[PDB]
Protein backbone atom coordinates (compact mmCIF):
# COMPACT_ATOMS: atom_id res chain seq x y z
CA UNK A 1 0.00 0.00 0.00
CA UNK A 2 1.34 3.55 -0.66
CA UNK A 3 2.39 5.09 2.59
CA UNK A 4 1.10 8.68 2.16
CA UNK A 5 -2.09 10.41 1.08
CA UNK A 6 -2.19 13.73 -0.77
CA UNK A 7 -3.82 16.60 1.11
CA UNK A 8 -5.60 19.58 -0.39
CA UNK A 9 -2.70 21.79 0.66
CA UNK A 10 -0.44 19.83 -1.72
CA UNK A 11 1.49 18.03 1.02
CA UNK A 12 1.59 14.27 1.61
CA UNK A 13 0.49 12.76 4.93
CA UNK A 14 1.53 9.32 6.21
CA UNK A 15 -1.55 7.14 6.50
CA UNK A 16 -0.24 5.52 9.67
CA UNK A 17 0.63 7.56 12.70
CA UNK A 18 1.27 7.05 16.41
CA UNK A 19 -1.36 8.24 18.85
CA UNK A 20 -0.26 9.79 22.14
CA UNK A 21 -3.39 10.39 24.26
CA UNK A 22 -2.92 8.62 27.61
CA UNK A 23 0.73 7.81 26.85
CA UNK A 24 2.37 8.44 30.23
CA UNK A 25 4.97 11.17 30.17
CA UNK A 26 7.58 8.78 31.53
CA UNK A 27 6.91 6.31 28.70
CA UNK A 28 6.05 8.43 25.65
CA UNK A 29 9.57 9.54 24.86
CA UNK A 30 10.70 5.96 24.42
CA UNK A 31 7.44 5.14 22.60
CA UNK A 32 8.05 7.84 20.01
CA UNK A 33 11.75 6.94 19.66
CA UNK A 34 10.83 3.31 19.01
CA UNK A 35 8.07 4.35 16.61
CA UNK A 36 10.45 6.45 14.53
CA UNK A 37 13.09 3.70 14.60
CA UNK A 38 10.61 1.14 13.22
CA UNK A 39 9.24 3.42 10.50
CA UNK A 40 6.55 5.73 11.86
CA UNK A 41 6.79 9.18 10.34
CA UNK A 42 3.51 10.69 11.71
CA UNK A 43 2.82 11.47 15.37
CA UNK A 44 -0.60 12.66 16.61
CA UNK A 45 -0.32 15.06 19.54
CA UNK A 46 -2.38 17.55 21.51
CA UNK A 47 -1.76 20.16 24.17
CA UNK A 48 -4.59 18.71 26.27
CA UNK A 49 -2.77 15.37 26.41
CA UNK A 50 -0.21 17.02 28.72
CA UNK A 51 2.75 15.13 27.23
CA UNK A 52 3.91 17.24 24.27
CA UNK A 53 7.21 18.14 25.98
CA UNK A 54 8.09 14.46 26.28
CA UNK A 55 6.94 13.70 22.74
CA UNK A 56 9.14 16.56 21.63
CA UNK A 57 12.20 15.16 23.43
CA UNK A 58 11.88 12.04 21.29
CA UNK A 59 11.37 13.91 18.03
CA UNK A 60 14.31 16.15 18.71
CA UNK A 61 16.60 13.29 19.62
CA UNK A 62 15.76 11.42 16.42
CA UNK A 63 16.34 14.57 14.37
CA UNK A 64 19.64 15.16 16.19
CA UNK A 65 20.68 11.53 15.66
CA UNK A 66 19.78 11.96 11.96
CA UNK A 67 17.51 8.94 12.04
CA UNK A 68 15.07 11.09 10.07
CA UNK A 69 14.96 14.53 8.52
CA UNK A 70 12.36 17.09 9.62
CA UNK A 71 10.85 17.08 6.14
CA UNK A 72 10.17 13.35 6.48
CA UNK A 73 8.13 13.75 9.68
CA UNK A 74 4.48 14.70 9.81
CA UNK A 75 3.67 16.13 13.22
CA UNK A 76 0.05 16.92 14.13
CA UNK A 77 -1.29 18.82 17.10
CA UNK A 78 -4.55 20.38 18.14
CA UNK A 79 -5.86 23.68 19.53
CA UNK A 80 -7.67 23.05 22.81
CA UNK A 81 -11.15 24.35 23.52
CA UNK A 82 -10.05 27.00 26.03
CA UNK A 83 -7.99 28.74 23.31
CA UNK A 84 -10.66 29.40 20.61
CA UNK A 85 -10.33 33.21 21.15
CA UNK A 86 -8.59 35.39 18.48
CA UNK A 87 -5.96 36.62 20.86
CA UNK A 88 -5.12 33.11 22.22
CA UNK A 89 -4.74 30.90 19.12
CA UNK A 90 -1.23 31.94 18.11
CA UNK A 91 0.14 31.55 21.63
CA UNK A 92 -1.49 28.16 21.97
CA UNK A 93 0.11 27.03 18.73
CA UNK A 94 3.46 28.50 19.79
CA UNK A 95 3.34 26.70 23.17
CA UNK A 96 2.77 23.43 21.31
CA UNK A 97 5.63 24.23 18.95
CA UNK A 98 7.98 25.00 21.79
CA UNK A 99 7.00 21.84 23.69
CA UNK A 100 7.41 19.69 20.57
CA UNK A 101 10.56 21.78 19.88
CA UNK A 102 9.51 22.31 16.34
CA UNK A 103 9.39 25.48 14.18
CA UNK A 104 6.33 24.35 12.35
CA UNK A 105 3.56 21.78 12.55
CA UNK A 106 2.59 19.73 9.54
CA UNK A 107 -1.05 19.90 10.60
CA UNK A 108 -2.87 21.83 13.31
CA UNK A 109 -6.48 20.92 14.13
CA UNK A 110 -9.34 22.56 15.95
CA UNK A 111 -9.59 19.76 18.53
CA UNK A 112 -13.33 20.09 19.16
CA UNK A 113 -15.80 22.55 17.61
CA UNK A 114 -16.80 23.97 20.99
CA UNK A 115 -14.96 26.85 22.64
CA UNK A 116 -14.77 27.01 26.45
CA UNK A 117 -14.01 29.88 28.79
CA UNK A 118 -10.25 30.59 28.79
CA UNK A 119 -8.25 29.95 31.91
CA UNK A 120 -6.09 27.38 33.59
CA UNK A 121 -8.73 24.65 33.61
CA UNK A 122 -9.16 22.60 30.42
CA UNK A 123 -12.82 21.94 31.30
CA UNK A 124 -14.11 25.02 33.16
CA UNK A 125 -17.36 24.08 34.87
CA UNK A 126 -20.24 25.95 36.44
CA UNK A 127 -21.38 24.93 39.91
CA UNK A 128 -23.73 22.34 38.39
CA UNK A 129 -21.08 20.65 36.27
CA UNK A 130 -21.87 22.08 32.83
CA UNK A 131 -18.91 23.27 30.77
CA UNK A 132 -18.68 27.05 30.58
CA UNK A 133 -18.76 28.07 26.93
CA UNK A 134 -17.01 30.69 24.98
CA UNK A 135 -19.12 32.85 22.68
CA UNK A 136 -16.53 32.22 20.01
CA UNK A 137 -17.86 30.50 16.91
CA UNK A 138 -16.20 27.98 14.60
CA UNK A 139 -15.88 30.48 11.71
CA UNK A 140 -13.92 33.00 13.68
CA UNK A 141 -11.77 30.22 15.12
CA UNK A 142 -11.15 29.03 11.58
CA UNK A 143 -9.99 32.49 10.51
CA UNK A 144 -7.50 32.38 13.39
CA UNK A 145 -6.25 29.00 12.13
CA UNK A 146 -5.81 30.46 8.63
CA UNK A 147 -3.58 33.15 10.15
CA UNK A 148 -1.21 30.43 11.40
CA UNK A 149 -0.69 29.16 7.86
CA UNK A 150 0.03 32.72 6.73
CA UNK A 151 2.57 33.17 9.53
CA UNK A 152 4.47 29.98 8.71
CA UNK A 153 3.68 28.21 11.99
CA UNK A 154 1.71 25.39 10.38
CA UNK A 155 1.74 23.84 6.92
CA UNK A 156 -1.90 22.65 7.02
CA UNK A 157 -4.96 23.29 9.15
CA UNK A 158 -7.93 21.10 9.84
CA UNK A 159 -10.74 20.14 12.18
CA UNK A 160 -11.59 17.33 14.54
CA UNK A 161 -14.92 16.02 15.78
CA UNK A 162 -16.81 18.29 13.40
CA UNK A 163 -20.17 16.92 12.26
CA UNK A 164 -21.50 17.23 8.74
CA UNK A 165 -23.20 20.55 9.36
CA UNK A 166 -20.09 22.00 11.01
CA UNK A 167 -17.82 20.89 8.15
CA UNK A 168 -20.34 22.47 5.77
CA UNK A 169 -20.31 25.65 7.83
CA UNK A 170 -16.56 25.95 7.35
CA UNK A 171 -16.74 25.13 3.66
CA UNK A 172 -19.46 27.78 3.27
CA UNK A 173 -17.57 30.37 5.35
CA UNK A 174 -17.69 33.83 3.73
CA UNK A 175 -14.21 34.65 2.55
CA UNK A 176 -12.83 31.17 3.25
CA UNK A 177 -9.09 31.24 2.53
CA UNK A 178 -7.96 27.66 3.23
CA UNK A 179 -10.21 24.62 3.24
CA UNK A 180 -9.70 22.17 6.08
CA UNK A 181 -7.20 19.58 5.03
CA UNK A 182 -8.35 16.92 7.50
CA UNK A 183 -11.28 16.05 9.73
CA UNK A 184 -10.08 13.74 12.50
CA UNK A 185 -13.00 11.71 13.89
CA UNK A 186 -13.60 8.54 15.85
CA UNK A 187 -13.89 5.58 13.50
CA UNK A 188 -13.77 1.84 13.93
CA UNK A 189 -16.06 -1.15 13.20
CA UNK A 190 -18.49 -0.12 15.95
CA UNK A 191 -18.72 3.49 14.65
CA UNK A 192 -18.15 3.21 10.94
CA UNK A 193 -18.99 6.79 10.02
CA UNK A 194 -20.05 6.08 6.46
CA UNK A 195 -22.10 9.24 6.04
CA UNK A 196 -19.57 11.73 7.45
CA UNK A 197 -16.67 10.05 5.67
CA UNK A 198 -18.40 10.17 2.31
CA UNK A 199 -19.27 13.85 2.84
CA UNK A 200 -15.72 14.81 3.77
CA UNK A 201 -14.09 12.72 1.07
CA UNK A 202 -16.43 14.21 -1.54
CA UNK A 203 -15.13 17.63 -0.54
CA UNK A 204 -11.47 16.57 -0.74
CA UNK A 205 -11.02 16.56 3.03
CA UNK A 206 -8.93 13.62 4.27
CA UNK A 207 -10.39 11.77 7.24
CA UNK A 208 -8.23 10.53 10.08
CA UNK A 209 -9.67 7.71 12.19
CA UNK A 210 -8.99 7.98 15.88
CA UNK A 211 -9.54 5.30 18.55
CA UNK A 212 -9.25 2.64 15.82
CA UNK A 213 -8.82 -0.11 18.44
CA UNK A 214 -11.73 1.18 20.49
CA UNK A 215 -9.54 2.93 23.04
CA UNK A 216 -9.51 0.12 25.59
CA UNK A 217 -7.53 2.40 28.00
CA UNK A 218 -10.04 5.28 27.84
CA UNK A 219 -10.48 6.39 31.48
CA UNK A 220 -14.30 6.12 31.38
CA UNK A 221 -14.42 2.50 30.12
CA UNK A 222 -17.12 0.45 31.77
CA UNK A 223 -17.38 -3.33 32.04
CA UNK A 224 -20.38 -3.60 29.75
CA UNK A 225 -18.92 -1.83 26.83
CA UNK A 226 -18.24 -3.64 23.56
CA UNK A 227 -14.59 -4.65 22.91
CA UNK A 228 -13.24 -4.60 19.37
CA UNK A 229 -10.05 -6.29 20.22
CA UNK A 230 -11.95 -9.19 21.84
CA UNK A 231 -14.74 -9.47 19.23
CA UNK A 232 -14.59 -13.06 18.00
CA UNK A 233 -15.85 -12.02 14.53
CA UNK A 234 -12.86 -9.67 14.09
CA UNK A 235 -10.48 -12.20 15.57
CA UNK A 236 -11.67 -14.67 12.92
CA UNK A 237 -10.81 -12.26 10.10
CA UNK A 238 -7.39 -11.73 11.70
CA UNK A 239 -6.79 -15.48 12.00
CA UNK A 240 -7.71 -15.99 8.35
CA UNK A 241 -5.03 -13.48 7.37
CA UNK A 242 -2.48 -14.67 9.91
CA UNK A 243 -2.44 -11.19 11.50
CA UNK A 244 -3.43 -9.81 14.87
CA UNK A 245 -6.81 -8.27 15.57
CA UNK A 246 -5.13 -4.93 16.03
CA UNK A 247 -3.51 -5.26 12.61
CA UNK A 248 -6.88 -5.90 11.03
CA UNK A 249 -8.35 -2.90 12.88
CA UNK A 250 -5.55 -0.70 11.55
CA UNK A 251 -5.66 -1.99 7.97
CA UNK A 252 -9.45 -1.50 7.84
CA UNK A 253 -9.44 2.34 7.81
CA UNK A 254 -6.36 2.35 5.52
CA UNK A 255 -8.41 0.57 2.82
CA UNK A 256 -11.16 3.21 3.19
CA UNK A 257 -8.60 5.93 2.21
CA UNK A 258 -8.39 7.05 5.83
CA UNK A 259 -5.39 7.96 7.91
CA UNK A 260 -5.22 5.97 11.16
CA UNK A 261 -3.46 6.75 14.45
CA UNK A 262 -3.35 3.79 16.86
CA UNK A 263 -1.83 4.56 20.25
CA UNK A 264 0.60 2.36 22.09
CA UNK A 265 3.39 2.73 24.60
CA UNK A 266 4.34 -0.92 24.32
CA UNK A 267 7.37 -1.30 22.04
CA UNK A 268 6.32 -4.70 20.63
CA UNK A 269 2.85 -3.36 19.81
CA UNK A 270 4.24 -0.17 18.28
CA UNK A 271 6.20 -2.37 15.90
CA UNK A 272 3.28 -4.81 15.28
CA UNK A 273 0.91 -2.00 14.53
CA UNK A 274 3.23 -0.77 11.77
CA UNK A 275 3.33 -4.14 10.00
CA UNK A 276 0.16 -3.50 8.06
CA UNK A 277 1.40 -2.66 4.59
CA UNK A 278 1.93 -6.28 3.40
CA UNK A 279 -1.57 -7.76 3.52
CA UNK A 280 -4.99 -6.89 2.10
CA UNK A 281 -8.48 -7.27 3.44
CA UNK A 282 -10.90 -8.45 0.75
CA UNK A 283 -13.94 -6.39 -0.23
CA UNK A 284 -16.03 -8.98 1.60
CA UNK A 285 -13.87 -8.55 4.71
CA UNK A 286 -14.33 -4.79 4.46
CA UNK A 287 -18.10 -5.01 4.12
CA UNK A 288 -18.22 -7.53 6.94
CA UNK A 289 -16.27 -5.20 9.24
CA UNK A 290 -18.58 -2.32 8.22
CA UNK A 291 -21.53 -4.49 9.21
CA UNK A 292 -20.48 -4.34 12.86
CA UNK A 293 -21.48 -0.69 13.22
CA UNK A 294 -23.48 0.04 16.36
CA UNK A 295 -23.05 3.82 16.57
CA UNK A 296 -20.92 3.26 19.69
CA UNK A 297 -18.72 6.20 20.65
CA UNK A 298 -15.57 6.20 22.83
CA UNK A 299 -15.47 9.84 22.82
CA UNK A 300 -18.42 11.77 24.10
CA UNK A 301 -18.74 13.81 27.24
CA UNK A 302 -21.82 14.58 29.24
CA UNK A 303 -20.50 17.84 30.75
CA UNK A 304 -20.27 19.32 27.24
CA UNK A 305 -23.55 18.12 25.74
CA UNK A 306 -25.39 21.43 26.19
CA UNK A 307 -22.68 23.49 24.50
CA UNK A 308 -24.18 25.07 21.39
CA UNK A 309 -21.49 23.45 19.20
CA UNK A 310 -21.40 20.00 20.81
CA UNK A 311 -21.14 17.81 17.75
CA UNK A 312 -23.01 14.62 18.61
Ligand SMILES: NC(=O)c1ccc[n+]([C@@H]2O[C@H](COP(=O)([O-])OP(=O)(O)OC[C@H]3O[C@@H](n4cnc5c(N)ncnc54)[C@H](OP(=O)(O)O)[C@@H]3O)[C@@H](O)[C@H]2O)c1
Pocket residue numbers: 018019020021022044045111160161184185209210211212213214215216217218229244246247261262263264265266269270272273298299
Ligand atom coordinates in the same frame (compact mmCIF):
# COMPACT_ATOMS: atom_id res chain seq x y z
N1 LIG B 1 -9.18 14.21 18.00
C1 LIG B 1 -9.70 13.67 19.12
O1 LIG B 1 -10.65 14.14 19.73
C2 LIG B 1 -9.12 12.36 19.56
C3 LIG B 1 -9.84 11.57 20.46
C4 LIG B 1 -9.37 10.32 20.80
C5 LIG B 1 -8.16 9.86 20.28
N2 LIG B 1 -7.42 10.70 19.47
C6 LIG B 1 -6.06 10.29 18.95
O2 LIG B 1 -6.18 8.97 18.47
C7 LIG B 1 -5.19 8.12 19.17
C8 LIG B 1 -5.66 6.71 19.19
O3 LIG B 1 -6.91 6.58 19.96
P1 LIG B 1 -6.94 6.07 21.47
O4 LIG B 1 -5.70 6.41 22.19
O5 LIG B 1 -8.25 6.59 22.01
O6 LIG B 1 -7.10 4.51 21.39
P2 LIG B 1 -6.66 3.27 20.43
O7 LIG B 1 -5.51 3.66 19.61
O8 LIG B 1 -7.91 2.80 19.79
O9 LIG B 1 -6.31 2.20 21.54
C9 LIG B 1 -5.16 2.40 22.39
C10 LIG B 1 -5.14 1.22 23.34
O10 LIG B 1 -4.92 0.01 22.60
C11 LIG B 1 -3.80 -0.71 23.11
N3 LIG B 1 -3.13 -1.35 22.02
C12 LIG B 1 -2.37 -0.72 21.05
N4 LIG B 1 -1.88 -1.56 20.17
C13 LIG B 1 -2.36 -2.80 20.57
C14 LIG B 1 -2.14 -4.06 20.02
N5 LIG B 1 -1.39 -4.27 18.93
N6 LIG B 1 -2.73 -5.10 20.68
C15 LIG B 1 -3.47 -4.86 21.80
N7 LIG B 1 -3.71 -3.67 22.38
C16 LIG B 1 -3.12 -2.65 21.70
C17 LIG B 1 -2.97 0.33 23.86
O11 LIG B 1 -2.24 -0.28 24.88
P3 LIG B 1 -0.70 0.11 25.24
O12 LIG B 1 -0.51 1.57 24.95
O13 LIG B 1 -0.65 -0.29 26.71
O14 LIG B 1 0.17 -0.78 24.37
C18 LIG B 1 -4.04 1.26 24.41
O15 LIG B 1 -4.59 0.74 25.62
C19 LIG B 1 -5.04 8.84 20.50
O16 LIG B 1 -3.95 8.41 21.25
C20 LIG B 1 -4.99 10.29 20.05
O17 LIG B 1 -3.70 10.53 19.50
C21 LIG B 1 -7.90 11.92 19.09
Ligand SMILES: O=C(O)COc1cc(Cl)ccc1C(=O)NCc1ccc(Br)cc1F
Pocket residue numbers: 021046048049050112113114299300301304307310
Ligand atom coordinates in the same frame (compact mmCIF):
# COMPACT_ATOMS: atom_id res chain seq x y z
O1 LIG C 1 -10.45 14.70 23.19
C1 LIG C 1 -9.56 13.85 23.01
O2 LIG C 1 -8.61 13.94 22.18
C2 LIG C 1 -9.60 12.58 23.82
O3 LIG C 1 -10.42 12.73 24.96
C3 LIG C 1 -9.99 13.52 25.98
C4 LIG C 1 -8.65 13.72 26.23
C5 LIG C 1 -8.27 14.47 27.36
CL1 LIG C 1 -6.60 14.70 27.65
C6 LIG C 1 -9.21 15.01 28.21
C7 LIG C 1 -10.55 14.80 27.91
C8 LIG C 1 -10.97 14.10 26.79
C9 LIG C 1 -12.44 13.96 26.57
O4 LIG C 1 -13.25 13.94 27.46
N1 LIG C 1 -12.79 14.06 25.27
C10 LIG C 1 -14.20 14.11 24.91
C11 LIG C 1 -14.75 15.46 24.60
C12 LIG C 1 -14.03 16.65 24.80
C13 LIG C 1 -14.61 17.86 24.44
C14 LIG C 1 -15.87 17.90 23.89
BR1 LIG C 1 -16.67 19.48 23.33
C15 LIG C 1 -16.61 16.75 23.68
C16 LIG C 1 -16.03 15.56 24.05
F1 LIG C 1 -16.70 14.43 23.82
Ligand SMILES: [Br-]
Pocket residue numbers: 112113114304307309310311
Ligand atom coordinates in the same frame (compact mmCIF):
# COMPACT_ATOMS: atom_id res chain seq x y z
BR1 LIG D 1 -17.45 19.99 21.42
